């Protein structure tokens, strides 16, 4: 897959953005119908 | 422990809804299951 | 108009609020003005 | 300090870039100037 890079200033911001990235990754691979059941 | 956020405009709403929905999702999918879904696709 | 969002937790709320305010700022500052700030304060 | 964040896929890269550029802009715009732009 097409891989990209971002420079992030500050450690807290990196932690926040790394969490968003990982969260978005999971949402992309969980069918919406599975996701409504987990909710 | 609940707050409501005011969002001005549709484009910001969709971005911020998306992020919020995604974080909540990570709070309710089990670690082993999340891994399965990432392996699969 | 106005949309509202139910956010769970103080920490998550502060993060999404900061993001909201940052996107707002980005929308009303011209790119030309942005680069002037990015160059002079960094 | 500076960190490098790897992202897979165009969709996600664009969203995260948008957020990160936004965060950085608000680190260099004075509080006073920021509220003037919001009022304008
Ligand atoms: Zn399971």
Numbering used by the authors:
A (entry chain G): 302 to 340
B (entry chain F): 303 to 343
C (entry chain E): 303 to 344
D (entry chain H): 303 to 342
What does the article say, verbatim?
Surprisingly, p63 and p73 require a second helix in their tetramerization domain for the formation of stable tetramers that is absent in human p53, raising questions about the evolutionary processes leading to diversification. Here we determined the crystal structure of the zebrafish p53 tetramerization domain, which contains a second helix, reminiscent of p63 and p73, combined with p53-like features. Crystallographic studies on the zebrafish p53 tetramerization domain then confirmed the presence of the p63/p73 signature helix in p53 proteins of a subgroup of bony fishes, providing evidence that the last common ancestor of p53, p63, and p73 also had an extended domain with an additional helix that was subsequently lost in many modern-day p53 proteins as a result of divergent evolution.
Size-exclusion chromatography multiangle static light scattering (SEC-MALS) showed that residues 302–345 form stable tetramers. Overall, the zebrafish p53 tetramerization domain adopts the canonical tetramer structure of human p53, which is composed of a dimer of primary dimers with approximate D2 symmetry, but importantly, it has an additional helix that engages in subunit contacts, reminiscent of p63 and p73. Individual subunits within the tetramer adopt a z-shaped conformation, consisting of a short β strand followed by two α helices (H1 and H2). The sharp turn between the β strand and helix H1 is facilitated by a strictly conserved glycine (Gly311), whereas the turn between the two helices is stabilized by a proline (Pro332) at the N-terminal cap of helix H2, which is strictly conserved in p63 and p73. Key intersubunit contacts in the canonical region are conserved, most notably the salt bridge between Arg314 (Arg337 in human) and Asp329 (Asp352 in human) that stabilizes the primary dimer. Depending on the mobility of the C termini within the crystal lattice, we were able to build the model of helix H2 starting at Pro332 up to Met344. This helix reaches across the adjacent primary dimer within the tetramer, resulting in antiparallel packing of two H2 helices. Tyr339 plays a key role in stabilizing the H2-mediated subunit interface. Because of the additional H2 interactions, the total surface area buried within the zebrafish tetramer is on average about 20% larger than in the human p53 tetramer (8,100 Å2 versus 6,720 Å2), which is also reflected in the dissociation constants, KDs, of the full-length protein tetramers (KD = 3.6 nM for zebrafish p53 versus KD = 19 nM for human p53 [Brandt et al., 2009)].
